[model samples]
Target: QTSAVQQKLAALEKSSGGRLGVALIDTADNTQVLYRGDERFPMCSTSKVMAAAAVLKQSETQKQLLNQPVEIKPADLVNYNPIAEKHVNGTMTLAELSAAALQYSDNTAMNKLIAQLGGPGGVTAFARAIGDETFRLDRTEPTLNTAIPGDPRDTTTPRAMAQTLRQLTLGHALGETQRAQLVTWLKGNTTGAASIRAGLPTSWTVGDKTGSGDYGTTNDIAVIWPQGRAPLVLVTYFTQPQQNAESRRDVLASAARIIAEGL
Candidate 1:
C-alpha cells in the first residue's frame, strides 16, 4: 500500500532545489514514517551535539564532575562563533561549556568539549560504539582555519544522526540527569530560528541542533513533541552545491512543515 507520509516527503524532496536527506521516526514505537536518508553531509556545529553526548556519557560512566572548570584559551575560539567571543580569556565548567555549545552553537565551547572528551576521533568512536556508524569527525571546529586545504571535515548521515538521537531517548547511552540536561540545552537553542523550528506548530516544542556550512549545507536534527501526541525524531539535511542561504533555510523550513503534516 502507498503511504501518504512517503508521498509528502517525496514532494518535499523534489521541491527542495537541492539534494535532501531526511529521516523521521516515531519515538513511541521506533516506527519509521518517512526515510529518504542519504550519504554523509558536513556536520558543522551540529557535530557539537554528538560531542556533547559523548562527554556526558563519559562523565556518567567515569563518575566525573561536570562542574569542573576548564580554562579557555585564545586558540580555543572557533571561527564564526559569536558565543565564543564573550567566553574567550575566561574559564567555564563542563556543564556551562555544553550549555553554550548546544544553546548558542558555540564553536569554542565545542572545541573545548571535544578536547575534554579526547578529540573529534573520540566523539566518532563513541558514536560508532553507540550504533551511529556513519559519523566521522576528522577535524574540529574552526575547520576553515585549522583544517588542511581540501581535507574533509566532520560528517554524518541523516539516518545515523537520527539514530544517535534515538539512543539518547533510549536511556541507556546517557543517564537520566544528563539526558534531561541535554534536552534542556537543545530546547533553548537560539540559532536558526527560521529553520526547522519555524515550520513547527507554535503549540509544539522541539529540541534540535542546526548545522550550516559553505556551499549551502544546512541540516537540523530534532526531537519534536506535538501537543498531546507521541514525540518524534526528525532529521533534515541539504547539500546544494549552489544556492543562497535563504533558499537552503527555506528548504528545511518547508520540509519541516511537510513532515509535521505527514505525522
Candidate 2:
C-alpha cells in the first residue's frame, strides 16, 4: 500500500508531468517522517544557502564581518540578477551580498560569496563538515551567454540538503550569532513566494530558498513554523524536461498545503 504522502506525490507527479523528489522532517523528533527518493537534484541557487554557511564559518574563526565590504566588478555580473545590477559595480558589505544571495537568489552575488569563501570547493567543504558529503560544485554561476547544455554539475540528495537546512536552523554547525544571521536573511527572502509560501496559510511563518534551471529543473527547501505546532522542514525537487514554471510552483505549493494542514 502506498503511504498517504506517496499517494499525494503520485497525483502531483501525474498532474505536473514531472519527476519529483521530496523529504519531510519533523524537527520535534529529528527524524525524516516522509521521503520519496534519494536522487541527487541540481542545487541551482539553492546552493547559496550552503555558501552562506561557509561564509558564516569563516566569520566564526577568522573574525570576518557581516558588515565587511566586498567589491563587485562589471565582469563579476552574471545573468538573471537584478539585485547585483542595482549595485552598478560598487562595493557592498558581506552582509548585503549574502542577503541578496539568499533573498533575491542573485547569481552575481553568489559568485562573489563563493570567491569570499575561497571558491566553490570552500562551499563543498562546509557541506561535508555538516554531514552532507556528496554536495559538490563544479562551476561558477553561468551567464545566459555562458551556460552549458546539460544537468547542472552541482547537485545533492534531497534528504542531505534538508538535513543541512535543519542543522543550520538548530545551530548544530554554526555559532549562535551566525545561526541568527542566517535565519534572519532566510526569513527576509522574498523569492519563491509562489513556490512554498503559496501553499501555506498567512498565519504560518516560512523561510525557504528556491532554485530553477534549464530542462525543467525546479526546487524548494523550506523550514516552516505553524501558528501552534512544531516546525516542519520540507524539500521538493523536480527534474522534468518540459514542465512549465507555473506547474512546478503549483505542485510544491500543493504539497506544502497537504503537510501543513495535516500538521
Candidate 3:
C-alpha cells in the first residue's frame, strides 16, 4: 500500500511541474524512501563528490596524494570557479581544490581534479572501484551540465547516488581518516545552504554537496544525523525543462521536510 509520504510526494510533483528523484536510507532498520529512485537524472556537480572520494581513497595507500600541488590557468575557468576566479594564475594544493569543488561547487577545481583522475571515465572508474557500478559521468564542466532528453550520459539513478554516498562516508570505501576527510569536506559545503540544508530540521547536523545545471537541474545529496537517532542519506534531485528558480529549489526543501516529519 502507498503510504502518506508517497502521497505527499505525488502531490508535490504534480504541483511543481518538475521531476523529483530521491533515495533516502539510514539506520539499522534499513529506513528507506524511494521516489522515482531508479530513474536516471543529470548528476551535474554531484559527481564531484565521486571525484573527491576517489582522491581520498587513493591517499590511503598512495603517499602524499592529497599534498600534490596543482596550478589553474585561465583557460580552465568555467561556471562557479570561485576557487580559481579570485586568484590570478591561481595555485593550490590538491586537497584544497578537492574541498573547493564540494564546498563551493568550484567548476575549475573539479576540472583540475578530473585531470587527476585522468578524465570523466576515471571518475566513473572510482565509483566502480568502490563497488558502485552504475554511477557515471560522461562529460566535464559545461558539457556535463547539458541534460539531453532521454540521455543517460552524465546521469545517475537516485538509488545509486545515495548508496554511493553512504558507502563513501559510512561503508568500506575509504579508511577512517579519509572517510572523515570526505565528510568534513561535505560539511564545509556552502552550495547546499538553500538546498537540502534549508529543508531539514535545525537540530540535525548535515554534510552535503549541491549541483546546479541547465534544464532547471538543482540537486543536493546529503548525510544527515538527527538527534537521538541514526543518520540518513538523502538525494533530492529535481528538474524540469522550463525553469522557475523558486519552484525547482523549493521542491527539494519540501521533500526534506516531508521526510523528516514522517520519520
Candidate 4:
C-alpha cells in the first residue's frame, strides 16, 4: 500500500514541475514517513491556520475580549475582499474575523487581527508556547534591502501543520469553547472550491482549508471524516508554472482520495 501511495504521489509531483511537497502522517502511528515529499516549503497563506490558532490560543489564555468588534481596512484585503460579503462592509468580532480568515481566506481579516495581536511577535510567542520552534513568522519580512526577506508571511512543514491542526482538534492549545469556534469556522471554508470538496461523495464531511498566491503556489489541508472509516488528514503543497486553483484542485482531490483509501 505504501508503494502504491508513493507511485501515485510521484506521478502527481511530476506535474508540479518538481516544485511540490506533500506529507501526511497518522498521529496514532509514530512511524517514519507517511507519503512524505519535501515536508518544508514556504507555507504562504496556509500559515494563516497556524497564526489564527496561535491568536485564539492567546485570546483564550488571557481571557481577551472576544466580543469586541474589529473593523476591516482596505489594506487588510489588499488583494481580496472578504468583509463585504455579508452586506456592504462593517466590523465583526475577533471570532468572526478568525472565521473569515479561514472560511474565505480573507487577507483583510488576518492583517487586522495580526495588528491587534501585536504584529508577528505575538504570533511567534504563540507558536513557541506550543513547542513549534521551527515553524515561524520571522522569514515573512518583506524589504528591498538585502537583509529583508522576499515575503512577509510564513512557511511550515507538513508534519508541523498536521500536528497544529491535530492539537486544535484535540482542544488542548485552546479551550473547547474557542477551539469549537475555530472548527466551526473551518467548516464554513469554501476556498479550495475545486479540490477536496470535488472528490468526496455527497455523504461525507470535509473539514478543510486552502491557500494560494501569485508565487505560483496552491496548498490545502483537510480532514476527511467518513461515516465508518477512520478520519485521515491530507495536506499537499504545490509550486510550479501551471499552479492555478483548478489544476491544483484536481491534483489535491486525487491526492486526498488516495490518503483516504490508504487509511
Candidate 5:
C-alpha cells in the first residue's frame, strides 16, 4: 500500500529532474514506513534532529534547564548580519536558540547548540545510546555548513531516519522528559514552507523541519497531526538534476499531504 504511494511520489520528483526518497512510521508501536524512495539522502539542516538528541542527552544527566538564561552574544550569532534583523541585535537563551534553530532555521542558533553538545562527540554519543550505528553525524562543528559546509554531511538511510523520529516521539531517544521537550520543539517548527507543510489541509498542524542547499536537494521530516490518528513521522528528500526554486517544491509538499491523507 505504501509502496504504491511511493511510486506516485517518485513520479512527481521525476518531472522535476530529480529523485525523491521518503520514510514514514507510526510512532505508537514502531510501525515501519509503508512507502519510501531512498530513505537516506544525507539531509542537510535535517541534522538538527541530531542536535536535538544531543541536547536531550545532556539534560538527562545534568540539572540545566532549557529556560535558563544563556546570553546570545555577537560572537554566538552565526552571521554577523543575519538575514533577520531583529535577531541580529540581541541575546537569546537556550530555549530561544533552539526556537530560532527550528522555527526560523537560524544557522547561528544551530551552531551554538552544536557547541553546547560538545561537538560531534556528543552527537555520536547519542547515536550510540540508541544502538543506531548508521545514522552518522559527519561532524560536530558548530555551524551546520561547517560540518559539511556547502554540502550535506549527516547521512542516514530512510529506515534510520524514520526510526529516529519514532524513537524520539516514543520516549526512546533519551528519556520521556527529553523526548517530550525535543518533540514539542519539533512540533513548533515554522520552516516547513516548501515540502512537508505545502500539501496539508489548510487548517492542519504539521510540525516538520526542512533542509535545502545549492545542490538541488530539499528535505523535510516531521511528525504530522492530521485530522485524526496520533502523530506520525514522515521524511521526504528531493534532489533534482536541475536546481529549482519553485515555492511549491513540486512533489515535496504533495507527498506530505498524501501521507497524511493515507493515515
Candidate 6:
C-alpha cells in the first residue's frame, strides 16, 4: 500500500536526488509513520551509540568501569580522532571516550570504545541482547565510512534503528544511570546542528546522533520530546550515487519537518 506519508517521502526524494528512508513513531500511541524504513542504508557513525551502550552495560557490573583508565596507542589513531589524539600514548577514562564518541564524534575515541567492547561483534551482541536483530557494526574507523552503495556490511534499516534507539534510551536495555548518561551524551552532541534538530520547534526537546558516508549518506536518529505530547523517535537516512552525493542537511531537516507537521 502506498500510504500518503510514503507518497510524501517519495516526492521529497524525487526532487532531492537521493533515496530517503524515514521511521517516525509517536511513543504515546506507538503510531508509526514510515517510508522505505525497512530498507538498509549505511550506518556511518550512528553505530557509536551501540558501542557506547555496551560500555555502559559493562559498567553495570564493574561499577568503576567508566572510571577505569584505558590507554590510547598511536596504532589506534585514524582520521578524525581529535579527542583521542590528545591522550596519545596516555590514558583516558572509559566514560571520557564514550563522551568523545557521542559528543565530539571522535574516530579514535570510538575505536577505543569499540575495543573496550572487544570489537564490532561485541556491539552487535549487545544489540541482539536488547532484541534488535537488524543493527550491525562489522568494521572500525575510517574504513567503516566507506558507505558503499548497496553494501550490507555496515547498514541497518531506519525502522530498526529507530526502534533500537527507543529500546536503549527509553526502554529497558540499560540500567537507569546508564540510559540517562547515554541520552545525555547524545543530547549534548555538537555535530548535528544542521540536521533533524534544526527542523523542530524550540518547544520540542531533541537528542540525536548524526552519521555520514559515501553515496550522499547523511543520517540522523533522534529521540524527540514534543510539548504536550509523548516523546517521538525519528530515523532519517538518505543516500545518492557517488557522483551526485551531496549529503544534504537541508534534506534531513525537511524530512524531519514533514514528520513533525504530519502530527
Best by TM-score: 6
The best candidate in terms of lDDT = 6
| lDDT of each residue in 1-263, candidate 4, tens digit only | 55777777777777655455566655445332344543555665676677678767767756666667876544344556456245235677777777777888766666656776687666767777877665666532221001112333466667776766666754387788877777777777878657666666657777788876544566787665666655556577665543343335577677666665655
lDDT tens digits, residue span 1-263, model 1:
44876676677767765667778878777787544565666777778888888888878866656888888778766576576677668778888889888888877888888888788788888888888778888777777222121335676777888888877854567889888878888888887677888888989888888887765777788888888978888888777655344337777888888777866
> What is candidate 5's lDDT per residue for 53-163, written digit by digit as tens?
677677777776566555556655544224223554555666676776777777676776777777766776677777666676666323333323224356666667766
Which has the higher TM-score value, candidate number 3 or candidate number 4?
A: 3
Q: Residue 16's C-alpha lDDT in candidate 6? A: 92
For candidate 1, give the lDDT of residue 202.
Answer: 83
Candidate 1, 104: how far from true, in Å?
Answer: 0.5
Winner on TM-score between 2 and 4 is 2
TM-score (all chains, Cα) for each model: 0.89, 0.91, 0.95, 0.82, 0.80, 0.97
Task: Give the per-residue lDDT digits (tens) of candidate 6, residues 1-263.
Answer: 88776777789999997889899989999989889889999899988888999999989999899999989989888989779899998999999999999988898988888888888898899989988899888999878888888788878999898999998899979999999999999889998879998888978888999988777789888999999989999999988877447778888998898888788
Query: In what order do the candidates fall by lDDT, top score first?
Result: 6, 3, 2, 1, 5, 4
What is the TM-score of candidate 4?
0.82
Residue 176 of model 1: what lDDT? 92
- State the C-alpha lDDT per candidate: 0.76, 0.78, 0.85, 0.63, 0.65, 0.88
RMSD of each: 2.9, 2.6, 1.5, 4.2, 3.7, 1.2
Supply the global lDDT for candidate 5.
0.65
Which one wins by TM-score: 1 or 5?
A: 1
Which sections of candidate 6 miss by over 4 Å? Answer: none
The TM-score of predicted model 2 comes to 0.91
Cα lDDT for residue 159, candidate 1: 80
